Amino acid sequence: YSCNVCGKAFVLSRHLNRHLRVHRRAT
Ligand SMILES: [Zn+2]
């Protein structure tokens, strides 16, 4: 699993989803 927005790889999908939420921000 990897954050498509950057390329940061994660082992767990749940962690990646949390990381995706951070990209769903404006600032
Ligand atoms: Zn990311």
From Swiss-Prot:
<comment type="similarity">
    <text>Belongs to the krueppel C2H2-type zinc-finger protein family.</text>
</comment>
<comment type="subunit">
    <text>Interacts with the SLBP/pre-mRNA complex but not with SLBP alone. Interacts with LSM11 in a U7 snRNP-dependent manner.</text>
</comment>
<protein>
    <recommendedName>
        <fullName>Zinc finger protein 473</fullName>
    </recommendedName>
</protein>
<comment type="function">
    <text>Involved in histone 3'-end pre-mRNA processing by associating with U7 snRNP and interacting with SLBP/pre-mRNA complex. Increases histone 3'-end pre-mRNA processing but has no effect on U7 snRNP levels, when overexpressed. Required for cell cycle progression from G1 to S phases.</text>
</comment>
<feature type="zinc finger region" description="C2H2-type 19">
    <location>
        <begin position="1"/>
        <end position="23"/>
    </location>
</feature>
